[PDB]
Amino acid sequence: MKAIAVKRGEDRPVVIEKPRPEPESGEALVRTLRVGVDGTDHEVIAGGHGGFPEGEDHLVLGHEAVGVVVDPNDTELEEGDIVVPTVRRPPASGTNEYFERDQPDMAPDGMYFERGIVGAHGYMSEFFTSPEKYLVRIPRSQAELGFLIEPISITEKALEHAYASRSAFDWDPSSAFVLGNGSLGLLTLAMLKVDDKGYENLYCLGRRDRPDPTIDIIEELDATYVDSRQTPVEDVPDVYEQMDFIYEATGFPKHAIQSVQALAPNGVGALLGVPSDWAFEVDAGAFHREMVLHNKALVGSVNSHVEHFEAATVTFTKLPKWFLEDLVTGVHPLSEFEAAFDDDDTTIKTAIEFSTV
Amino acid sequence: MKAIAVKRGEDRPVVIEKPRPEPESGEALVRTLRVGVDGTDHEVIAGGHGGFPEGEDHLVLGHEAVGVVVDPNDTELEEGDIVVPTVRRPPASGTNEYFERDQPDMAPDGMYFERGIVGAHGYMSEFFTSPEKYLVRIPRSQAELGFLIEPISITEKALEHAYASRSAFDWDPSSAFVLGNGSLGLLTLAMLKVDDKGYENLYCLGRRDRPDPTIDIIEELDATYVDSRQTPVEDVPDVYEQMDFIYEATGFPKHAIQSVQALAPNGVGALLGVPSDWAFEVDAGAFHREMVLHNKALVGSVNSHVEHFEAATVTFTKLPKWFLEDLVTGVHPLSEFEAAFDDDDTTIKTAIEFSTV
Ligand SMILES: NC(=O)C1=CN([C@@H]2O[C@H](COP(=O)(O)OP(=O)(O)OC[C@H]3O[C@@H](n4cnc5c(N)ncnc54)[C@H](OP(=O)(O)O)[C@@H]3O)[C@@H](O)[C@H]2O)C=CC1
Ligand SMILES: NC(=O)C1=CN([C@@H]2O[C@H](COP(=O)(O)OP(=O)(O)OC[C@H]3O[C@@H](n4cnc5c(N)ncnc54)[C@H](OP(=O)(O)O)[C@@H]3O)[C@@H](O)[C@H]2O)C=CC1
Ligand SMILES: [Zn+2]
Ligand SMILES: [Zn+2]
């Protein structure tokens, strides 16, 4: 079978061949339909070759997959089922409490593999296998954009934990502010528009010049574009209003600190960004006091699990068609896959199509 | 009646006289039994005279009161009821959503008064009044140490919010680390010992040399004393273990930052400290990434309300007698009240006795 991979010492994704996998007990064989490209794929391609599987020359890319079950094997799935795989699998040493308790998304460093990211091949091959417990059935009509279910699920989990932080009181948020205009930020912005919390005012932070398709999406969702070069996060309460909810998706460390200042009393920041170490001058006293005197929270979140993938299917149905059309800037056949790894301002979410149903 | 107050331009608490208050509709008249002294009382005495009531020459001190109802007026309380007052009352402009929804503890700055702290006289007078809704009945045998109910309630709320942050998954903490060996830290340490979470290992951070009565309390509770001069917060995972729960009660801004590093994956820090602005070099990138990759939370908490005072009475019953004996270093009759404002290492929790039942 064909697969798209990064090889050791190389700086580009390429087509390789490897045998079609065979499902072990409790696993189904899946024919890959479409796989989304993400920042993490770009990070692997950049020179992050520490994530390769034990004793292997390459890493198959892609962790945002949708496929069709072609061999249900000894599982309870049926042939023809449209499924999305979860990302996390047990590490080398085998299972642990996180996997046993059906919460591998809460497993710490070294206690999981992530397919297409660290320790395990991804989904950008014509076929893959997975335990039935990690295959989430989705509605058949979500096959076309099914590669979106995984990133939606990231937000489903983050919101679940952030909202849990506020559950000891009657929290009544009216404003939400997404930091970041990548596909995650933009997905989250549309999600917050359909959120039960009934947000009145939505904002999204970026740093683009017009004309820009992320600005257009933000504005078409009836949200305010906040150009950080004009109005930084801490200035936002002056220029706009205090934000009950902040969802951080920039990976900018200053935003973790400054979100505390931009928050309304009793608000929560969800942090999703993954920055490298970076030291600079912080008014920790103001950070600390503001958290306390105004009963604020910061909640970090990573990965997601089955419940979040199921929630994502419901959320998907509520997402506007125009939005899905504009968010997905290109689906590329495997024949011309290289275009999927385009990275520029007009490129929002791409995917590679391996087959059709 | 007699009261203990700070007057404008003066640097010491003194006895004053003012008329006995008369209960308005919905209020009871209370005879003050005992009032605890806290750090906030010391801060008022220091030169924080911005908290005085509108157009008044003095602030009556004390916010940790226990008393006996002597006139139930038109309320549902009975004469002889032992009660503890909540601290927060409506601001000048009158009621608001926080007060209306029975959550004034979540009111932001300027939207409340705190009796004995800002905008309203405290409880260090022979008599006081309060709405029945802010008077919490407690068991009669808690009259002697009833001034402890308010600070216990501070922790009851903080734990409620911190634990709420962890409620989206099956959190199974085994370790807890209290930062601070003031009366709040020590109360919290004994509370975490009787907490349903069933903590296996307890730690408390201080910076005292032996012999010291706070060290003795920590060790007698079967907790580990962590001298920050030896093992700072960030070093604690090396020397000891990663902490599932951290309760910050130092008011040291570095501890807000460093608690993130000392936390176990999926852990939460409660912040209670109130520092002034203080800027210094922080590795914000490491702070940010650690929050996210390891699904951690920070939750700030201030004040408390009726539900927390009720919970505090239950917790009180579970507290060891030796602990209560050792925690309360002096109860001083009003006649010799000055000793209550002693502030040294052997002084833990003091109170002033205005009357007996
Ligand atoms: N915790 C988790 O499970 C997950 C975490 N992530 C992380 O979340 C973050 C967002 O993911 P994704 O949206 O896909 O990644 P992107 O890098 O594509 O999105 C980040 C966006 O933030 C913008 N940005 C960065 N700094 C600033 C700033 N100072 N002011 C205004 N805008 C800024 C960038 O704008 P510009 O292009 O103009 O520079 C970019 O469009 C990343 O750090 C990623 O690592 C992603 C997926 C899951
Ligand atoms: N949010 C809320 O509702 C409430 C907040 N507070 C706040 O919580 C904090 C604790 O209250 P309380 O216990 O009564 O106050 P204390 O000041 O009496 O307690 C703080 C303790 O922390 C210790 N400490 C300070 N810095 C360090 C450090 N670097 N290393 C080790 N120990 C340190 C001090 O030790 P030492 O004496 O040796 O210097 C002191 O014993 C205060 O900041 C207070 O303002 C208090 C009540 C309610
Ligand atoms: Zn993804
Ligand atoms: Zn108190």
UniProtKB/Swiss-Prot annotation, chains A, B:
Residues the record lists as binding NADP(+): N181, G182, S183, L184, R207, R208, S228, L272, G273, V274, S301, V302, N303
SUPFAM superfamilies (alphabetical): GroES-like, NAD(P)-binding Rossmann-fold domains
Protein activity control: Activated by molar concentrations of KCl or NaCl. Inhibited by EDTA in vitro.
Details of cofactor binding: Binds 2 Zn(2+) ions per subunit. One of the zinc atoms is essential for catalytic activity while the other has a structural function, according to Ref.4. However, the crystal structures show a single zinc ion, the catalytic one.
Enzyme class, first EC level, given as a word: oxidoreductase
Binding site for Zn(2+): D38, H63, E64, E150
Alphabetical list of InterPro entries matching this protein: ADH-like_N (IPR013154), Glc_1-DH_arc (IPR026583), Glu_dehyd_C (IPR031640), GroES-like_sf (IPR011032), NAD(P)-bd_dom_sf (IPR036291)
Binding site for substrate: T40, H49, E114, E150, N303
Reported cofactor(s): Zn(2+)
GO molecular function, one term: NADP+ binding
Pfam family, one: ADH_N
GO BP annotations, alphabetical order: non-phosphorylated glucose catabolic process
EC number(s) stated in the UniProt entry for this protein: 1.1.1.47
Catalytic activity: D-glucose + NAD(+) = D-glucono-1,5-lactone + NADH + H(+); D-glucose + NADP(+) = D-glucono-1,5-lactone + NADPH + H(+)
Function: Catalyzes the NAD(P)(+)-dependent oxidation of D-glucose to D-gluconate. Displays broad substrate specificity since it is able to catalyze the oxidation of a number of alternative aldose sugars, such as D-xylose, D-galactose, and D-fucose, to the corresponding glyconate. Can utilize both NAD(+) and NADP(+) as electron acceptor, with a preference for NADP(+). Physiologically, seems to be involved in the degradation of glucose through a modified Entner-Doudoroff pathway.
The protein's assembly and partners: Homodimer.
Family of this protein: Belongs to the zinc-containing alcohol dehydrogenase family. Glucose 1-dehydrogenase subfamily.
Additional detail: The reaction follows an ordered Bi-Bi kinetic mechanism, involving an ordered binding of NADP(+) and D-glucose, followed by an ordered released of gluconolactone and NADPH.
Protein name: Glucose 1-dehydrogenase
Organism annotation: Haloferax mediterranei (strain ATCC 33500 / DSM 1411 / JCM 8866 / NBRC 14739 / NCIMB 2177 / R-4)
Organism taxonomic ancestry: Archaea, Methanobacteriati, Methanobacteriota, Stenosarchaea group, Halobacteria
